[PDB]
Write an enzyme that holds these catalytic residues in place. Structure first.
Site, PDB file in Angstrom:
ATOM      1  N   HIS A  62     -64.416  34.811  71.733  1.00  0.00           N
ATOM      2  CA  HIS A  62     -65.447  35.412  72.571  1.00  0.00           C
ATOM      3  C   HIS A  62     -66.853  35.262  71.972  1.00  0.00           C
ATOM      4  O   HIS A  62     -67.836  35.322  72.733  1.00  0.00           O
ATOM      5  CB  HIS A  62     -65.102  36.885  72.823  1.00  0.00           C
ATOM      6  CG  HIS A  62     -63.657  37.110  73.150  1.00  0.00           C
ATOM      7  ND1 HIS A  62     -63.052  36.654  74.305  1.00  0.00           N
ATOM      8  CD2 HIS A  62     -62.699  37.734  72.407  1.00  0.00           C
ATOM      9  CE1 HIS A  62     -61.766  36.999  74.281  1.00  0.00           C
ATOM     10  NE2 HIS A  62     -61.520  37.658  73.099  1.00  0.00           N
ATOM     11  N   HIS A  88     -72.989  39.208  65.134  1.00  0.00           N
ATOM     12  CA  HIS A  88     -72.497  38.195  66.049  1.00  0.00           C
ATOM     13  C   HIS A  88     -73.461  38.013  67.219  1.00  0.00           C
ATOM     14  O   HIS A  88     -74.487  38.684  67.295  1.00  0.00           O
ATOM     15  CB  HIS A  88     -71.111  38.598  66.529  1.00  0.00           C
ATOM     16  CG  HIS A  88     -71.120  39.800  67.409  1.00  0.00           C
ATOM     17  ND1 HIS A  88     -70.713  41.042  67.004  1.00  0.00           N
ATOM     18  CD2 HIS A  88     -71.528  39.897  68.702  1.00  0.00           C
ATOM     19  CE1 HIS A  88     -70.831  41.875  68.029  1.00  0.00           C
ATOM     20  NE2 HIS A  88     -71.332  41.186  69.098  1.00  0.00           N
ATOM     21  N   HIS A  90     -74.609  36.690  71.405  1.00  0.00           N
ATOM     22  CA  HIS A  90     -74.412  36.417  72.817  1.00  0.00           C
ATOM     23  C   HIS A  90     -75.440  35.391  73.271  1.00  0.00           C
ATOM     24  O   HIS A  90     -76.610  35.468  72.893  1.00  0.00           O
ATOM     25  CB  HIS A  90     -74.445  37.711  73.645  1.00  0.00           C
ATOM     26  CG  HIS A  90     -73.409  38.693  73.181  1.00  0.00           C
ATOM     27  ND1 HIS A  90     -72.094  38.731  73.619  1.00  0.00           N
ATOM     28  CD2 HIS A  90     -73.524  39.592  72.167  1.00  0.00           C
ATOM     29  CE1 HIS A  90     -71.439  39.680  72.941  1.00  0.00           C
ATOM     30  NE2 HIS A  90     -72.315  40.227  72.028  1.00  0.00           N
ATOM     31  N   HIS A 107     -76.086  40.935  67.452  1.00  0.00           N
ATOM     32  CA  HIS A 107     -75.653  42.314  67.352  1.00  0.00           C
ATOM     33  C   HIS A 107     -75.183  42.607  65.936  1.00  0.00           C
ATOM     34  O   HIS A 107     -74.117  42.141  65.566  1.00  0.00           O
ATOM     35  CB  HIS A 107     -74.554  42.588  68.381  1.00  0.00           C
ATOM     36  CG  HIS A 107     -75.053  42.647  69.791  1.00  0.00           C
ATOM     37  ND1 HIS A 107     -74.262  42.434  70.897  1.00  0.00           N
ATOM     38  CD2 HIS A 107     -76.327  42.857  70.244  1.00  0.00           C
ATOM     39  CE1 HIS A 107     -75.014  42.537  71.991  1.00  0.00           C
ATOM     40  NE2 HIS A 107     -76.304  42.801  71.611  1.00  0.00           N
ATOM     41  N   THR A 173     -70.044  46.108  74.481  1.00  0.00           N
ATOM     42  CA  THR A 173     -70.122  45.193  75.606  1.00  0.00           C
ATOM     43  C   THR A 173     -68.830  44.371  75.736  1.00  0.00           C
ATOM     44  O   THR A 173     -68.768  43.448  76.541  1.00  0.00           O
ATOM     45  CB  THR A 173     -71.375  44.311  75.460  1.00  0.00           C
ATOM     46  OG1 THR A 173     -71.122  43.293  74.494  1.00  0.00           O
ATOM     47  CG2 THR A 173     -72.605  45.118  75.083  1.00  0.00           C
ATOM     48  N   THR A 174     -67.793  44.676  74.944  1.00  0.00           N
ATOM     49  CA  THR A 174     -66.523  43.988  75.070  1.00  0.00           C
ATOM     50  C   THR A 174     -65.411  45.022  75.128  1.00  0.00           C
ATOM     51  O   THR A 174     -65.511  46.072  74.491  1.00  0.00           O
ATOM     52  CB  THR A 174     -66.285  43.012  73.912  1.00  0.00           C
ATOM     53  OG1 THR A 174     -66.200  43.748  72.698  1.00  0.00           O
ATOM     54  CG2 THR A 174     -67.375  41.978  73.751  1.00  0.00           C
TER      55      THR A 174
HETATM   56  C1  LIG Z   1     -63.727  45.924  67.149  1.00  0.00           C
HETATM   57  C2  LIG Z   1     -65.242  45.758  67.352  1.00  0.00           C
HETATM   58  O1  LIG Z   1     -66.005  45.977  66.466  1.00  0.00           O
HETATM   59  N1  LIG Z   1     -65.735  45.356  68.666  1.00  0.00           N
HETATM   60  C3  LIG Z   1     -67.150  45.141  68.950  1.00  0.00           C
HETATM   61  N2  LIG Z   1     -68.129  45.059  68.069  1.00  0.00           N
HETATM   62  N3  LIG Z   1     -69.367  44.829  68.603  1.00  0.00           N
HETATM   63  C4  LIG Z   1     -69.446  44.677  69.921  1.00  0.00           C
HETATM   64  S1  LIG Z   1     -70.920  44.347  70.913  1.00  0.00           S
HETATM   65  N4  LIG Z   1     -70.812  43.098  72.064  1.00  0.00           N
HETATM   66  O2  LIG Z   1     -70.917  45.589  71.643  1.00  0.00           O
HETATM   67  O3  LIG Z   1     -72.101  44.639  70.075  1.00  0.00           O
HETATM   68  S2  LIG Z   1     -67.852  44.896  70.532  1.00  0.00           S
HETATM   69 ZN   LIG Z   2     -72.154  42.056  70.871  1.00  0.00          ZN
END
Ligand SMILES: CC(=O)Nc1nnc(S(N)(=O)=O)s1
Ligand SMILES: [Zn+2]
EC number: 4.2.1.1
Length: 222
Positions: A62, A88, A90, A107, A173-174
């Site tokens: 993802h 990470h 987007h 993020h 957001t996931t």
């Molecule tokens: C297990 C876990 O840490 N999941 C997530 N971490 N960051 C996210 S985000 N798209 O919201 O910033 S989703």
């Molecule tokens: Zn994120």
């Protein structure tokens, strides 16, 4: 349970993929958001205590995530200290400013010692190549997998000196789209190449932004 950004398990359907994912559709305090109207308030200043660490770079299906197996990279706000776990990306951005979508968003995901989660977000405009990201881009796993980077990576270089932010409360957001997440979105934008954006998309396999969610009761401070 599998989920994604396109096809039949897309974000508008995440709610009914399983019972544990049900807050993706019924939640009232969900991320991301279109930041349009704000409230001008005296927000507490961010203190970044990031340093070099031995990170690894993962592609989890993802996104392209950069995991921190030790503490040591923290950020302090309003008294509480928050340990960076992973950051990470987007492409394109998830959060919007005045209906504007940026070519990429980062993020930086944290927990304080209560396990209270905070996301610090950097927004990327189109511009010159991002010299500070090229270290991660080089080793970027182009399918699901993991490489230990063997040169230290310094996340301090991925944050601005000018640390004004927008503050709201939200969710992941996931899936499972868990709520209780503090969102700080930085006002000073970083920059990426068109090629760095394509490359991410090539690795991850799609545009990996959830559509923006209603603010409902929530106010965004600036
Ligand atoms: C297990 C876990 O840490 N999941 C997530 N971490 N960051 C996210 S985000 N798209 O919201 O910033 S989703
Ligand atoms: Zn994120």
């Amino acid at each position: 349970t599998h989920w994604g950004y396109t096809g039949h398990d897309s974000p508008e359907s995440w709610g009914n993929l399983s019972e544990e994912f049900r807050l993706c559709s019924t939640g009232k305090n969900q991320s991301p958001v279109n930041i349009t109207e704000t409230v001008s308030g005296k927000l507490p200043a961010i203190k970044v205590n990031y340093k070099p660490s031995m990170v690894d770079v993962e592609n989890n299906g993802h996104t392209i995530q950069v995991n921190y197996p030790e503490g040591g990279n923290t950020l302090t706000v309003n008294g509480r200290t928050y340990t960076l776990k992973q950051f990470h990306f987007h492409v394109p951005s998830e959060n919007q400013i005045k209906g504007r979508t940026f070519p990429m968003e980062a993020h930086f995901v944290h927990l304080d010692e209560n396990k209270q989660p905070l996301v610090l977000a950097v927004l990327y405009e189109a511009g010159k190549t991002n010299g500070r990201l090229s270290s991660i881009w080089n080793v970027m796993p182009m399918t699901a997998g993991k490489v230990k980077l063997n040169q230290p990576f310094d996340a301090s270089t991925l944050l601005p000196k000018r640390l004004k932010y927008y503050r709201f409360a939200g969710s992941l957001t996931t899936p499972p789209c868990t709520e209780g997440v503090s969102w700080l979105v930085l006002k000073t934008y970083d920059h990426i190449d068109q090629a760095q954006a394509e490359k991410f998309t090539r690795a991850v396999g799609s545009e990996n932004n959830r559509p923006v969610q209603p603010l409902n009761a929530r106010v965004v401070i600036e």
